[PDB]
């Protein structure tokens, strides 16, 4: 499920209250070079900082595992899905 | 914006105050804005102005959005009338 | 025709000489050597002298064969912009 | 008689007035080639931007990058099928798109080149973001040199212009303004924007073009508008080799009258570079200072203005006039020296910030100017 | 006061974009400085070679 | 050129962050007033 | 008078590049077909 | 025919609400120039030379704003009424257009017979008098 | 209430068509993820396209659920036929229809010397060379950061790493043009596919090759810059002289004895 976007994964983590740090953006991932390690973002996002970020692949794998693990029951969700579809205009 | 993190005034190379670098190149831009008991009073007035201005901007933006929707409605009606009149004229 | 053609450049020689005097090449164009000194090689540049007193001298040099007819156009143009355009056929007009 | 020739006064700018300008530049704009033998050359935007960087103008101006326009945003004017084909077409599969290309007027005089959608989206995004920042009131001037291609119709791409971002910019300005005055300086008639806004009052599509044997074939004195847009199509057809003094004497009265009567709130000023001496197809003889006096006069009023690029089939002169206009927008006069840049060797043998007029037959007799001014004033008093 | 989670995340993404742009600028500047240097060295080489050949 | 484009990037980042903060505040306000509209228009019926 | 068109990479180098990348990645060698369309 | 009726109905409600809005603008129009002048004087670069002046200018701005909120909230209220009434009117208008355009029915035929009786009754009210 | 009947028939038809408990529960998990304001509508549609791709009507239901003959206004413009006035424009706001014109369309009513042509040819060649060089330089600038990242990343992630379309660049086509040109525009398909799929092993090679090509083309540009400079030395000024080329003909034609008699005879005739 790495084919998705950053917004979907961030909102998934927020909704399910998962304890996984937000994924690093593709540009943020490529930022981390030898000279790229001297920038503010990389020097403040690597060690000793609670705001540390991690790659998109691992977060995608974690979300895929949690999504497949999370079982579903049609009676609980299908009416909720119909209500949300008929409510989006409001 | 003057009372918040953003800078409403335009900032230039002089305003950014970036430190000189010789090939500090990635250094953050130091900035300055336009401007016990007494300092607490000043903070109280600053906070008061802050949230009252937020409320005022909120109200004005909501009013403008409402007027935008009303003008959309009026333009819709005018276009309908013009199109039907042109159709009638086209008939004869 | 000769009188009016000469007057059309005499009336603006006053400002043309000032423009020529105030001309200053940029420091970093001589390195590229695109500034062709052919006018400087033949002295056709108007710097340091009045424009009219050079244009009549060059007209005389053309009429007596001192200067080739081909170079006269550029010799006057690079100093006079293109406001002295009419008097390229000065030799034939004087001959007529 | 209305036209009255006057001597060209020196450039003067108010030092007390302060103007905010938000220059827009997408670094990837100048990397698409129309073809081997095509007059259109997007490199001029990059050379002009390099000039503004080197002149030191960045210390007194704001510059950003405009996000590319989305397909739905770009469809605010053009038809769905047109944009769909423009996206789907590539220089390598036109054999299966021959009928669509024939219908859409593309391929023969306007050919298909890779990155066409990227260029169109960049120009549209520049125009739309300029208009959006104009509405928000943060910047008084929103310079978008990338776009300005006003020859694009609703369903046809004629005159080397595939997308008309000026229409989208005017639309996003009209979302918060009742009346915006549009000024054209391109030699060709602005057929696209004119046709788009020919039946409306909320715009003032003023123009200064040339009438003769051309591709547009429009821009007569007769065309003034239909419906509520009657007498709201100001055209000033001209002829060969209009010089600086007479162009200024034509421009200043007309613009003064428009601002006194029409009273717009924002100006979408086209600044096409093909109205200069030494152009590839443009027949005018206007110098760069003449090309910038119009912009300075428009700026002197003190109202929000959106400057856009547009045509211009030469590179050096267009870049020079664009950087001079950008400097003049800051109440700063640029010196004649062109400081060294990567593309310095382009700028002719003079290497000075100036484009010099050529000797062309000034067919623009004063009688024609008087007649056209009288007609324009007569059709303008009705506003 | 900027404590919002979504606003903070967007600020972090924008700062990452800014820092990558600053890195790319430095890398490109160094590369084209090297390009200018090698061109200048080749120019000197050719000039000296033509001098000696003449 | 390096100084110019560095300042350009910093200006672009500042503009983007200001625009995004304003967008978020406006979206919060819009949702608040939409909620108030819905609450007012739900009691009428 | 007229400059020749800017040259592309010689075929003897494009074949080396494609073969090198195919062999290092694990792909089979270059097929003897031309996907002309 | 309903299109004609909604076209008549539009301007009346629009004008009632706009007159209300004009009244709200009237009751607070004398403080906008004062607020703008105070803001511009505050944003002057030669102003920070006395702290008490900054305090008093901030106090004046706060007082003006405290007086200015009520007009703004009344403006929101009247604009919301505008929006909902106009929404209803546009709903009626575009149902009318859709019905009139879908067919280039007996219920609306009956209304013609009901109105034909009224037209017949009113025409005979002059003959019989 | 009736609308629920057809929706439930749709759901049971989907259950019958899919014919797999695992696929159906995955699809319903996706639907629930949409229902929790997590999945975007377009993302939801494109995801369910995998399941409901082969049924046209079922997928349609789901997508639904979630120029002289004309009259002329003057000489320039003409009136569009009705069969063309309404054409698909899905981006229009409420005001995008009010001001923009639909029925009125434009319709057109219907000399250079040999030195401006040479100057324009010079400019065309200059622009061609500079355009190629600048495209290569931009691609090199992007691949420089790409390779600087590749060389600082562990072998464990080299194999599975993939570069998204765009390579982090704003333009999705600039990087394609240089590769097509350098690799003869035919075999470049494999190179670009490998770059998309295998960045760690293609980006360094392509970056080095592009650097070599940039150096070679800079050498060629330096070589031809002298020729362009020389050919622009002697043509720029005479290009601006439009009438001077025929000035000799004009002078020899305006002073002929026949013209001398004619310019007086015609003036006398006009005066009479
Ligand atoms: Zn043009």
Residue numbers in the entry:
A (entry chain J): 104 to 193
B (entry chain M): 216 to 238, 287 to 298, 328 to 384
C (entry chain A): 1153 to 1248
D (entry chain B): 1 to 383
E (entry chain H): 56 to 109
F (entry chain G): 255 to 299
G (entry chain H): 291 to 327
H (entry chain L): 12 to 115, 129 to 153
Task: Please give me the paper's original passages concerning this structure.
The Rpd3L histone deacetylase (HDAC) complex is an ancient 12-subunit complex conserved in a broad range of eukaryotes that performs localized deacetylation at or near sites of recruitment by DNA-bound factors. Here we describe the cryo-EM structure of this prototypical HDAC complex that is characterized by as many as seven subunits performing scaffolding roles for the tight integration of the only catalytic subunit, Rpd3. The principal scaffolding protein, Sin3, along with Rpd3 and the histone chaperone, Ume1, are present in two copies, with each copy organized into separate lobes of an asymmetric dimeric molecular assembly. Rpd3 is the sole catalytic subunit in the Rpd3L complex.
The cryo-EM structure of the Rpd3L complex reveals an overall architecture comprising two giant lobes attached to the stems of a two-stemmed cross-brace scaffold. Lobe I is formed largely by Rpd3, Sin3, and Sap30 and is wedged between the stems of the cross-brace. Lobe II is made up of Rxt3 and a second copy of Rpd3 and Sin3, but unlike Lobe I, engages only one of the stems. Stem I is made up of a heterodimeric, anti-parallel, two-stranded α-helical coiled-coil comprising Sds3 and Dep1. Each lobe and stem together appear to form an independent structural unit. This bipartite organization takes the form of an asymmetric dimer characterized by Sin3 and Rpd3 engaging with each other extensively and almost identically in each unit of the dimer. Unexpectedly, the Rxt2 polypeptide chain snakes through many nooks and crannies in both lobes, engaging as many as six subunits and serving as a molecular glue while also stitching the two halves of the dimer together.
